[PDB]
Amino acid sequence: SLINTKIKPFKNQAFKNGEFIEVTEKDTEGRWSVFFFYPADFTFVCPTELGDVADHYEELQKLGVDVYSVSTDTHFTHKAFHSSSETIAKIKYAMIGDPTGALTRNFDNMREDEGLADRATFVVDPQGIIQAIEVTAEGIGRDASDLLRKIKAAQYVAAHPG
Amino acid sequence: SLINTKIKPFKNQAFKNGEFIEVTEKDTEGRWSVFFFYPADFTFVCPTELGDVADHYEELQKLGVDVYSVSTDTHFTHKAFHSSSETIAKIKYAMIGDPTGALTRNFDNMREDEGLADRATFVVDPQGIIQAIEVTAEGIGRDASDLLRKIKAAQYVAAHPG
Amino acid sequence: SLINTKIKPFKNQAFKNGEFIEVTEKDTEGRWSVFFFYPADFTFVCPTELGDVADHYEELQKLGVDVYSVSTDTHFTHKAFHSSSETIAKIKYAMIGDPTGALTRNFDNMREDEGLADRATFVVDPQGIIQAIEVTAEGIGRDASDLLRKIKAAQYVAAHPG
Amino acid sequence: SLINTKIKPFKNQAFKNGEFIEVTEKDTEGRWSVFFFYPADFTFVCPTELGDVADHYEELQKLGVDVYSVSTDTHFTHKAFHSSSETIAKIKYAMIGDPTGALTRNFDNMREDEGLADRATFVVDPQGIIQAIEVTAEGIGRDASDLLRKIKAAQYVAAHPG
Amino acid sequence: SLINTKIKPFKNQAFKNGEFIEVTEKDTEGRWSVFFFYPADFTFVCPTELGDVADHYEELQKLGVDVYSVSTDTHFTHKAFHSSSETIAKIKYAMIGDPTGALTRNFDNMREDEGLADRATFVVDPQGIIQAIEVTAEGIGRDASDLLRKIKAAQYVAAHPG
Amino acid sequence: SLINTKIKPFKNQAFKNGEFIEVTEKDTEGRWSVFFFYPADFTFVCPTELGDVADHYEELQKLGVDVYSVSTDTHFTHKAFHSSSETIAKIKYAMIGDPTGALTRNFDNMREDEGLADRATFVVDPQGIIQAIEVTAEGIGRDASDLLRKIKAAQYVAAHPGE
Amino acid sequence: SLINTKIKPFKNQAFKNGEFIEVTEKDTEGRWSVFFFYPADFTFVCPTELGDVADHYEELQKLGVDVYSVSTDTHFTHKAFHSSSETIAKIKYAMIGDPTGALTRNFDNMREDEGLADRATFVVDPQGIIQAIEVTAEGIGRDASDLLRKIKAAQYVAAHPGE
Amino acid sequence: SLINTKIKPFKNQAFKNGEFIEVTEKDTEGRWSVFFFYPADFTFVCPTELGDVADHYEELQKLGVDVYSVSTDTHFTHKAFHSSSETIAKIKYAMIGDPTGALTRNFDNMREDEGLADRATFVVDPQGIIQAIEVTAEGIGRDASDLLRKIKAAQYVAAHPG
Amino acid sequence: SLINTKIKPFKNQAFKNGEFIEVTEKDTEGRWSVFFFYPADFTFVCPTELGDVADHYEELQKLGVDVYSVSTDTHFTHKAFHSSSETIAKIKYAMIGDPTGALTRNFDNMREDEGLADRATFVVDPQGIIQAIEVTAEGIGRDASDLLRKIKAAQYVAAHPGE
Amino acid sequence: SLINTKIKPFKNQAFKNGEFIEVTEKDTEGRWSVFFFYPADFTFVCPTELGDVADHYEELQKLGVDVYSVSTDTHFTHKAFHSSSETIAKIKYAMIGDPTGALTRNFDNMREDEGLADRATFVVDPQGIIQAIEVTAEGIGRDASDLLRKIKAAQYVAAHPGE
Ligand SMILES: [K+]
Ligand SMILES: [K+]
Ligand SMILES: [K+]
Ligand SMILES: [K+]
Ligand SMILES: [K+]
Ligand SMILES: [K+]
Ligand SMILES: [K+]
Ligand SMILES: [K+]
């Protein structure tokens, strides 16, 4: 698995709070990052997973943990989605667009048959190291509370080596 | 270029008139087909390049021509789009979603560095042989008026050789 | 990721209830199997992870779920470990020894520079399709309760498609 | 396709207004250039596709656009041709001879099985970046009228971005 | 050299006495053939060489010897040339067009830099065997009388082996 | 065979008298080393081979010989075994853990289909040259005394060239 | 190592009891064989090893063990060697000549820079499986007694799986 | 063909006027050289070709033209042949022996299945550029007079470009 | 060396007593053949080697031995040489022309930088097996008598195995 | 063939006059050398060839020619062979042992399926250039007289270019 590997550089357009920004691997340096991949915007799956994460975003920011949602949709497309479903509107974190699929493949998370990302979550430490990975098949939901638990523990071991 | 080639096989999801269908190379069928590629849904140029084609779509069945718009967004993404712009609401032809980019690359029409299709239009005759090609950079619109041009008598030469 | 792939073949020896047995992919066919990897036996990191899973074993067996713990240690070491830690003594599921590291490499779960497996968990359905993956660096525990959640969830989707 | 690429270097002989010159990629110059490809000289469709372009040539310097017709015949062959058809006599732009087919293949525009160029027209801006492409099978003529189309404001977007 | 090798198959369009025909390698079977390559039609070199051959064409036909002029020009192009210079008008033999260069390269006679054939003459016997080759640089003329001399001698040895 | 070759570099974790150590080829320079391989800790075979070596360890240390027992188990596993067993508690020499098999593989001594080392012993001189190799299938024990003999000889020839 | 492997096929000439014979792998089947390699005949770096083995030879023989000495010399050289030394003269088991080095390479026991075999001993059971290997540098003698031991041990385990 | 290429390097022994000498490409530099290949010495085909060339030797020397006959025979055989046939005795030019066939293979003039040179003639200018090639099957003689014609012709063009 | 190998197939043109013949390996089957190589015809070295062979040819033909002289010249050239020379006019055996060098190259006997054969002689038995090879630099003549001796021996051993 | 080539470098052990020595290519420089290969010592397919060469040895010696016999046996085997046969006992030139077969392969003179050298003789001039080669199958003896002849002939041509 990619556990304990360094994420590789990337440059994508993303959507974060009414504006279009650019995220690259430098921006993740010095920070804790959570990459939340999902297959696609505007799908009939209830977006609860992206929103569930939104709910913990204030505590995540408080812990110095940044968040990035990712789909092979364009960033233009994330916006429409953010401003259309009330649940999706709770997102204040960056919503990265990866239409080239480059980011998704960097994390070896592509459903190569469908051109969409698998439902995977990655926890990356300040050094660019992947410290926790979770991937699930369509229908198996990710509970943001457990992600958070891993994250505090992850942060802890960096600080208390034993 | 692909002028005069037989189109290659494909299976993409698409949206047509309220709910979702499949398109394959055979659905093109013994008909004249128009593949109208465009970069992406929801961007800010309002694209009724697409809408003009829609306006002229009724007249496009004319001849037994199907019109297929194509972008690297998903079909989920195209509908959401048919519902946001009234100008886009005008579309009665198939909006094909090509998330894997395979359809786009079949027509050698991918902006590989962006993961989006280029502004290219293709005219395909009933045995699937491409009879006309037009490609432009963004900002240079395509007129359906004589996109309609001239399918022509492409018609004719094909039914009155020379 | 290995998501949605069918697991590969293996034949390994294991300690399960006081006895040495052999395990193969065939023993998993038709059942839900959970493959729980860990670095090594007799280490000083507490097997709270393994015992927690054992506590829920009564419960995994109800859903028709098999549990296989895996380390690059021998089944012999597993027999020994099962007799020294009271937390480990509780294990009623199979402890697979993968001294050749082949089973571990099957799930691409090897730390090659150490010769030990990563803290990885896999949920495999009766058709041998991996439906869930969870991997963590040491110090970042895997929550057994949450594991159970995913499995029940995995089971629904499987009996009630979308 | 070649949409948006930098043209590759070339040196071909050509005919212009009574006697023979050289064209290289640099003669394109900080100007808008039009490469008008056609199959061959002296065939029997009378081609004033070429002549229309000639008719509209005066207006084509307009903007500082050069017009270059291209076929796999030699420059010797193009002149003989300027002298046989009064309609062809109308041409004041460069008729490039491309016997080696290198110019044609630079624009990926060769009918490899015939050794003739396809009916393709290309618009190149002053730094040599292709901004527009149109290709058709024989029998489907190209209208200079809006070949002139729209060079456009290709002009504009380039001098008024977006 | 290609002396004593069998010519390889080909299919070109050619011009012979007011009409457009097709020549292939089958047509040369059972006959003596002379392939007279030249660089290009409508050049400022005096076409005396093609015409000089015309002068001996009646005797060549009388001896069962066919003739083929060849250039990378199209056959359309040979016509214009045949009906424009009084010297070129003497040709009653086929004037093959090889715009793909395939024939010329079959005889390894291409000026690869210029896309034109070298000034070479080939004598091919009824079995497809090359029996006499002559190639010269621009400006060195081929005297048809000597070609004829070689040809009778060539025909003779086939008949009188010694 | 590997006879008369220089041992290759290695870095392994090990157990030696209650503590974890690192062992590398550099740790062998200038000394006589015995690399004592065995399949695995905690198996059902009685460990007389390891123990027999321990019995002669004192005497080997006088001759300036280091002993490294080696299996593909981890050092963690050696810790456990060293406490749990009878005879192994007698072990005061280094127990090297080779989970990656590189040490074992260095000596061409891996049972690849098993992921375990063969029952093999090697005598290595101060320059890292292997002077004696002994390998046997299970049930055929290695005699520590014969090992010592060979070692004495190895040291002799080495200190008195050409006889 | 070649431990626990089946010997590869061979066809060699040999000196046996005043006579020249052919030996092949088919000739080892069903028997316990000891392949005793040595550098060369007529060295006189001590030929104690060949002679020592000769002394334990019928004890080896009616444990049902055959002994084959092997060097890269010819069988011709072996009879000659057998006729000059009272110690070598004592050898009554087969002395295989391996001029091509094929047997030696079979047991991967060749010193390539010298063109001679190493001081290696191999024990092969009736199934052609190598159960024991002993290799030493020149000067480090091989103990016949320890060989005998190993062979008996090998035979036991082989007839009594689980002790 | 080898037309217009610079000849390759060679060092061969030869018979020239009663003496054995060595010949290299350097001995040709700055001169017009004619390389006359033939199958073999002492054959029964009459060297009328060689003697005819000798008759014109007086004359080749006037134009500053060197003559080198070449066969895969040795210079030794050439000495012998020069003394047996009165027609051959006339040879005052160099008879190069190419026993290794390398010189012959340089001009790609070898009949590989026979180990002999083809009846080939080459005209090389002072800069080492081959300006004329004539090759024939046996029985088809090369005309020396015609050779001379080409050489004079070759010389003009060289002193009066186009 | 090519000693004890089967000659490879060949087809060459040749001169033999005024006529042109083809010679192939098939023409050698069942006979003893001597392939006598030399650099070239018409050179400045006196041809005693070819002539010496001719002198013994009669006698070789009684022993059932065929002689093929070989150079990379053509058969045409051999014709010439056979008439022009002294001693070569004495030649009644086949003079093979090898302009392509395949025969010469068959016997590994080509001076590649010269395009000529080395002064080499080969004795080949009825089964196409080379039994004797002799090669010398210029100035060191090959003695036909010694050739005969060798041939007699070759025939002997061949008709009376194992002495 | 290797005719007219320079010998490749070598370092071998040998038996010489009751003593063991080293011979290398540097030891042939400036002298005429005869490399006399033979299958093996102690065969007794006739050792006439080695003895015959010994008889012509000082005639060879004060033409300034050195003689080196070569077999794939060891030098050890050669002294032994030199002590048993009155005919071999007569050899006073160096007997090179080539256990590795390197010298033999240098002269491309090895019988690979047997591990022994062929009956080949080579003449090397002071510049290390092979001027003469003679190879024969077993049973076809090599004539010492003809060797001597060739050597004198070789030396002449070498000192008198053009005769
Ligand atoms: K996409
Ligand atoms: K292990
Ligand atoms: K052309
Ligand atoms: K010591
Ligand atoms: K040997
Ligand atoms: K030749
Ligand atoms: K006979
Ligand atoms: K030997």
UniProtKB/Swiss-Prot annotation, chains A, B, C, D, E, H:
Broad enzyme group: oxidoreductase
Keywords: Antioxidant, Cytoplasm, Disulfide bond, Oxidoreductase, Peroxidase, Redox-active center
GO biological process: cell redox homeostasis; hydrogen peroxide catabolic process; response to oxidative stress
Protein role: Thiol-specific peroxidase that catalyzes the reduction of hydrogen peroxide and organic hydroperoxides to water and alcohols, respectively. Plays a role in cell protection against oxidative stress by detoxifying peroxides.
Record family assignment: Belongs to the peroxiredoxin family. AhpC/Prx1 subfamily.
E.C. number(s) listed in UniProt: 1.11.1.26
Remaining remarks: The active site is a conserved redox-active cysteine residue, the peroxidatic cysteine (C(P)), which makes the nucleophilic attack on the peroxide substrate. The peroxide oxidizes the C(P)-SH to cysteine sulfenic acid (C(P)-SOH), which then reacts with another cysteine residue, the resolving cysteine (C(R)), to form a disulfide bridge. The disulfide is subsequently reduced by an appropriate electron donor to complete the catalytic cycle. In this typical 2-Cys peroxiredoxin, C(R) is provided by the other dimeric subunit to form an intersubunit disulfide.
Localization per record: Cytoplasm
Thioredoxin domain: residues covered: 1-156
Reactions this protein catalyses: a hydroperoxide + NADH + H(+) = an alcohol + NAD(+) + H2O
Main location (coarse class): cytoplasm
Active-site residues, record numbering mapped to chain: 46 (cysteine sulfenic acid (-soh) intermediate)
Database matches in SUPFAM superfamilies: Thioredoxin-like (SSF52833)
Cellular component GO terms, alphabetical: cytosol
Pfam families per record: 1-cysPrx_C, AhpC-TSA
Taxonomic source organism: Salmonella typhimurium (strain LT2 / SGSC1412 / ATCC 700720)
InterPro entries: AhpC (IPR017559), AhpC/TSA (IPR000866), Peroxiredoxin (IPR050217), Peroxiredoxin_AhpC-typ (IPR024706), Peroxiredoxin_C (IPR019479), Thioredoxin-like_sf (IPR036249), Thioredoxin_domain (IPR013766)
Subunit structure: Homodimer; disulfide-linked, upon oxidation. 5 homodimers assemble to form a ring-like decamer.
GO molecular function: NADH-dependent peroxiredoxin activity; thioredoxin peroxidase activity
Gene that this sequence comes from: ahpC
Protein's name in the database: Alkyl hydroperoxide reductase C
